[PDB]
Design a binder for this molecule. Sequence first.
Ligand SMILES: [Mg+2]
Ligand SMILES: [Mg+2]
Ligand SMILES: [Mg+2]
Ligand SMILES: [Mg+2]
Ligand SMILES: [Mg+2]
Ligand SMILES: [Mg+2]
Ligand SMILES: [Mg+2]
Ligand SMILES: [Mg+2]
Ligand SMILES: [Mg+2]
Ligand SMILES: [Mg+2]
Ligand SMILES: [Mg+2]
Ligand SMILES: [Mg+2]
Ligand SMILES: [Mg+2]
Ligand SMILES: [Mg+2]
Ligand SMILES: [Mg+2]
Ligand SMILES: [Mg+2]
Ligand SMILES: [Mg+2]
Ligand SMILES: [Mg+2]
Ligand SMILES: [Mg+2]
Ligand SMILES: [Mg+2]
Ligand SMILES: [Mg+2]
Ligand SMILES: [Mg+2]
Ligand SMILES: [Mg+2]
Ligand SMILES: [Mg+2]
Ligand SMILES: [Mg+2]
Ligand SMILES: [Mg+2]
Ligand SMILES: [Mg+2]
Ligand SMILES: [Mg+2]
Ligand SMILES: [Mg+2]
Ligand SMILES: [Mg+2]
Ligand SMILES: [Mg+2]
Ligand SMILES: [Mg+2]
Ligand SMILES: [Mg+2]
Ligand SMILES: [Mg+2]
Ligand SMILES: [Mg+2]
Ligand SMILES: [Mg+2]
Ligand SMILES: [Mg+2]
Ligand SMILES: [Mg+2]
Ligand SMILES: [Mg+2]
Ligand SMILES: [Mg+2]
Ligand SMILES: [Mg+2]
Ligand SMILES: [Mg+2]
Ligand SMILES: [Mg+2]
Ligand SMILES: [Mg+2]
Ligand SMILES: [Mg+2]
Ligand SMILES: [Mg+2]
Ligand SMILES: [Mg+2]
Ligand SMILES: [Mg+2]
Ligand SMILES: [Mg+2]
Ligand SMILES: [Mg+2]
Ligand SMILES: [Mg+2]
Ligand SMILES: [Mg+2]
Ligand SMILES: [Mg+2]
Ligand SMILES: [Mg+2]
Ligand SMILES: [Zn+2]
Lengths: 97, 206, 155, 97, 23, 127, 60, 83
Amino acid sequence: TMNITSKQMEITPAIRQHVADRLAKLEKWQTHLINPHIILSKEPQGFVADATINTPNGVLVASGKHEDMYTAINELINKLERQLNKLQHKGEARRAA
Amino acid sequence: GNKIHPIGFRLGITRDWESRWYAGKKQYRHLLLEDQRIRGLLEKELYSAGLARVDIERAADNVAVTVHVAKPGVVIGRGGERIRVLREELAKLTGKNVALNVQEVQNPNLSAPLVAQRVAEQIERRFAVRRAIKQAVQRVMESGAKGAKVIVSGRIGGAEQARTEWAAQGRVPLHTLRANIDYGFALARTTYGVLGVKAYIFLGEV
Amino acid sequence: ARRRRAEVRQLQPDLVYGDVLVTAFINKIMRDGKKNLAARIFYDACKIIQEKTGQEPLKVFKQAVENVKPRMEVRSRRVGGANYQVPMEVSPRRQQSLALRWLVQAANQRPERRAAVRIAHELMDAAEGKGGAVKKKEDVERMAEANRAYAHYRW
Amino acid sequence: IRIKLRGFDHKTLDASAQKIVEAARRSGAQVSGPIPLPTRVRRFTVIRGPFKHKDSREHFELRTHNRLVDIINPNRKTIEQLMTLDLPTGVEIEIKT
Amino acid sequence: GKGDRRTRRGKIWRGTYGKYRPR
Amino acid sequence: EQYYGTGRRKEAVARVFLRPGNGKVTVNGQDFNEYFQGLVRAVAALEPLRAVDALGHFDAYITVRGGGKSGQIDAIKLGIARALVQYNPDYRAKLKPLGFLTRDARVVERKKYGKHKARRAPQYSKR
Amino acid sequence: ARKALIEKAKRTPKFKVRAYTRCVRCGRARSVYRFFGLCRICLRELAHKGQLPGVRKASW
Amino acid sequence: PRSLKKGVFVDDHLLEKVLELNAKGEKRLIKTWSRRSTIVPEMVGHTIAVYNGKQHVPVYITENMVGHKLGEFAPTRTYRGHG
RNA sequence: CAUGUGGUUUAAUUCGAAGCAACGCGAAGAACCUUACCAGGCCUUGACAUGCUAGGGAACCCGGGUGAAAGCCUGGGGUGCCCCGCGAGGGGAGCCCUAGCACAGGUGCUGCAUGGCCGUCGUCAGCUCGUGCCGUGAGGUGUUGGGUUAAGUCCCGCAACGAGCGCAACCCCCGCCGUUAGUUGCCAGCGGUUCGGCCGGGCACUCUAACGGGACUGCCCGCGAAAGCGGGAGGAAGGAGGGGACGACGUCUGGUCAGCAUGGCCCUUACGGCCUGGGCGACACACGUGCUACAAUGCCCACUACAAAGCGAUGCCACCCGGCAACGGGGAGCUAAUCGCAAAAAGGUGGGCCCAGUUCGGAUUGGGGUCUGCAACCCGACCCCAUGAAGCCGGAAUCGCUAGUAAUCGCGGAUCAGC
Ligand SMILES: [Mg+2]
Ligand SMILES: [Mg+2]
Ligand SMILES: [Mg+2]
Ligand SMILES: [Mg+2]
Ligand SMILES: [Mg+2]
Ligand SMILES: [Mg+2]
Ligand SMILES: [Mg+2]
Ligand SMILES: [Mg+2]
Ligand SMILES: [Mg+2]
Ligand SMILES: [Mg+2]
Ligand SMILES: [Mg+2]
Ligand SMILES: [Mg+2]
Ligand SMILES: [Mg+2]
Ligand SMILES: [Mg+2]
Ligand SMILES: [Mg+2]
Ligand SMILES: [Mg+2]
Ligand SMILES: [Mg+2]
Ligand SMILES: [Mg+2]
Ligand SMILES: [Mg+2]
Ligand SMILES: [Mg+2]
Ligand SMILES: [Mg+2]
Ligand SMILES: [Mg+2]
Ligand SMILES: [Mg+2]
Ligand SMILES: [Mg+2]
Ligand SMILES: [Mg+2]
Ligand SMILES: [Mg+2]
Ligand SMILES: [Mg+2]
Ligand SMILES: [Mg+2]
Ligand SMILES: [Mg+2]
Ligand SMILES: [Mg+2]
Ligand SMILES: [Mg+2]
Ligand SMILES: [Mg+2]
Ligand SMILES: [Mg+2]
Ligand SMILES: [Mg+2]
Ligand SMILES: [Mg+2]
Ligand SMILES: [Mg+2]
Ligand SMILES: [Mg+2]
Ligand SMILES: [Mg+2]
Ligand SMILES: [Mg+2]
Ligand SMILES: [Mg+2]
Ligand SMILES: [Mg+2]
Ligand SMILES: [Mg+2]
Ligand SMILES: [Mg+2]
Ligand SMILES: [Mg+2]
Ligand SMILES: [Mg+2]
Ligand SMILES: [Mg+2]
Ligand SMILES: [Mg+2]
Ligand SMILES: [Mg+2]
Ligand SMILES: [Mg+2]
Ligand SMILES: [Mg+2]
Ligand SMILES: [Mg+2]
Ligand SMILES: [Mg+2]
Ligand SMILES: [Mg+2]
Ligand SMILES: [Mg+2]
Ligand SMILES: [Zn+2]
């Protein structure tokens, strides 16, 4: 199931759960999110939400950066979505000819 | 960080150990240890001589340390004064037959570790770091080397952005084992930190 | 790999029959590199297919081979938007290789207790034309035939 | 009537055996040639970097090669001028009988 | 069983000796 | 009185002593068949003389040391093959196309740092 | 805790077990070779400079 | 365990204190740092204060508790469960 | 089941690594120590540096009280010197004490201030410079192009002609051969042969470790403008002989202030220092690496063979004995081509198990012992009796490996008292 690392930061089970809830957006696609991995970090610049997920047709790797941690967490999601959606439909592009 | 140390890499091919001796299973760790404390003292004082090697020879509770160096007089002393005052200081540490010699160096500008401290020094003198390096390689080629490559790292000129400058000239084939390339490192201090001056002198291939 | 085609490894003929084919079949019985153990079993089996059927183990062996060599097979190849079962003839080389593999495999799928026995029996049934090995062979050939349709999609 | 040679360097262990071979063969009488004894190898393996990076070590060794000579029919014309013998630095010598 | 301390095969593994593997 | 070749294989070396006779063979003072008892690999340790009609015509006193029961076997195959070619230098063809006249240099490749053996890499994971 | 620590190492213990190797060169508590008195980083450094006799890079 | 050839172990600085209390007759709070120490038939009836890392734990001793060490009855880890 | 990690728990569960390139990673040895963490008792020029100044005497060795130890208290026996020394007798300086004062010290922070060292893309075939040339210019040319190669490898072509860092080569191992070398190693033939290459004797052979040789697409044929490619011979090896060492300009504001060095910021009876104890080993859970299995190509007892590289003077320990054994008591050999670790295991002959949650499997637990160690409660490895779990070949997903490889079997070493 799903894992989260808070690198050189202290975070709460609240904050963790929200992150659970956020990755859910991906569930839409109805493919398997296998051992998703979220890593949250603080740069000088603002925070960073990393993610690496294997699904039956490939992996998601992403990085969101923002002054707001939550915003960074979302940007992470925006990138992941895109990747996954392209993962699920790059197939269909070449059906004919 | 990729590159191999070009001296550890020629050891017993084009460059021979800075310590030649055997010592047994039971002694080596202490034997080597003096050689180290010996070199600290020696390099500590003999900086001002411009020393480029400290050899240590041993047989049986006695050692002949050869010092090769740029300006031998500073080591020798007042008409013979320091040299022994050091064999004195020496076997204070050594406690055995500390037989100190000297050697002169024909060209300090064809001895790498020298060229290195020189330009390392210049930067502490608040000098123009691009130009220093430019000249170091420029002097070493006028001094006849087959190749030359000086390399400075760190907050150059004082910058907040750690930068890494270098120039080189002729050939400096670090991949070649038969090529003799002298390498020497000087670590320069400034008010804002450490800059890493590396020197590469290719002298000739056997 | 990419560049030039690989070379067929040459086997050292076995020190009982001197047959190149026999060698391969032993090594297919070989597990963990313990070759002698595997060598034992092949011969063990011949002991059985000599007594249990009164003539040359060897001859029976090469028949079980010709009777498990599959001639046409399918090789999946996506055309357009569907994965097609494409019919193709098995290279001579590969008929052997396969027919070997299936022989042993079919065997280990058996209830008689020593490996020594099964390799005999399977090699017995398959030599005539019966046997779980042939069942794999027979099947592989129907798959080819049924799909005769998609055979201009051969490469 | 025999000498034993232990050092880290081989151009020297060979050169010094070679000369003692020449010392007592000239100076009388019989010398059983410099025998090349099997080298005992002290090896060192060490992780290249200072922190993490487990699978990139550097490989080091310490060859201590052995040498034995015999001066067969002794004749202390030799046994004298061996106290007058020129031995390099990186070799230690052993004599018993 | 390369891990059952109580056999010949086992004391070889665990690099020991006992009743089931004497010297 | 005698014929010799030196046989090698992996870390195994074979000293072969041929002396024409009833064809009988010995390994380290021990009977051939007694030494390789139950190793089918054996009968081609004596193989190269069969490439030259020589089974019973020569005997074999044989020393062997190092390696394993089989590379040893292999080196013997080289060593006896070696000796028949000194005994009879017109034996080049009819031993060399059979390849007996060579010594496969195929030895254990080194265990490397970062791997598990010579080549078996360690198992990793993207996710 | 550094020089305070390298010092506690130098001195003789209140019991015999507490003998622990430090590097003589940098003070490192871990990966310290008996044969040299050095930890593996230091070990590597001098050997590279050449200040380690017989010690060369092994290639095989 | 600890070898039988050697002697069943007490810290000496505790053993004496045990027995200094035998002379006058028990019973004192013996604050201790000695989990290392076996419980001894001479310790029965006493209540030794065993140090677990934070606290000197009041520990009563009886007949059934002789072979064990002093640290067993001042456990060290606090764990009320998970969640 | 072992180990790392996420997490939660906690007095504390020290800290860093973070997709590939963090996760049996720094840790090539956490009971104490280590050890940076917590509780508690302490220390204030201080565990260590260089000093300046007053009181002792220097310098050292030994116990006494309290105390968990640390510490707080402490009873003792003499400073050489050069001095006025016949003596009372004072100075002095290596080295300790006590009090001050400088200062020490900090694994406290910033790898987004840094040197160094490493990972990585990548052993990938690349990255550039000089001058000329083209372009107002960023920049192009060269480095593209035809062919070839493992390759910016070579050929040919060309506004280019050269050159540099890389590729290659020179270094190491294995493969064949010769030279030198003959004990502690080797033993073909003679003699003994105490039945052990044990002795005579020899270096043949085996080996040992040093020095050269050898392979160069050289030869042949064919294809080729050429470089080269296909193929045959000779050879131990043939087209790069198999492996290693070596990693371009740079990239990832990659990793490390906790190896070290280091600018700056920060602590100063404390963010330093010492010690006892606890913690780093926590356990509703999740992940990574792995060990052993689920068995008859298998398991068990017996008997029988064949390695290699290493290590070994508070060390390896033959062999003798007590012991079911771990082990213990004796005790020979060796600074080790001698003496020892030592048995290699798979394997081989034989015998039992007869398809069973078992003669599989070896977790968990009870109980009894061994060793290290000041001490194995937390928390060591090992032996023996008993216990004899999950597990019947593993979903989605997914790792390795192209030959002496994968698979499978054992052996050594580092660190280390033990583990
Ligand atoms: Mg990232
Ligand atoms: Mg899109
Ligand atoms: Mg099948
Ligand atoms: Mg690893
Ligand atoms: Mg069992
Ligand atoms: Mg197994
Ligand atoms: Mg060899
Ligand atoms: Mg047989
Ligand atoms: Mg192997
Ligand atoms: Mg420090
Ligand atoms: Mg220890
Ligand atoms: Mg240590
Ligand atoms: Mg935690
Ligand atoms: Mg930190
Ligand atoms: Mg990794
Ligand atoms: Mg450990
Ligand atoms: Mg601790
Ligand atoms: Mg502590
Ligand atoms: Mg950085
Ligand atoms: Mg960091
Ligand atoms: Mg850096
Ligand atoms: Mg230009
Ligand atoms: Mg234009
Ligand atoms: Mg112009
Ligand atoms: Mg340009
Ligand atoms: Mg380019
Ligand atoms: Mg260009
Ligand atoms: Mg081109
Ligand atoms: Mg290449
Ligand atoms: Mg080129
Ligand atoms: Mg061109
Ligand atoms: Mg010779
Ligand atoms: Mg070719
Ligand atoms: Mg190269
Ligand atoms: Mg960063
Ligand atoms: Mg630091
Ligand atoms: Mg700092
Ligand atoms: Mg300032
Ligand atoms: Mg402590
Ligand atoms: Mg603890
Ligand atoms: Mg840990
Ligand atoms: Mg494991
Ligand atoms: Mg059961
Ligand atoms: Mg059972
Ligand atoms: Mg414990
Ligand atoms: Mg079950
Ligand atoms: Mg079953
Ligand atoms: Mg499976
Ligand atoms: Mg299996
Ligand atoms: Mg699947
Ligand atoms: Mg490959
Ligand atoms: Mg092992
Ligand atoms: Mg060991
Ligand atoms: Mg150990
Ligand atoms: Zn160090």
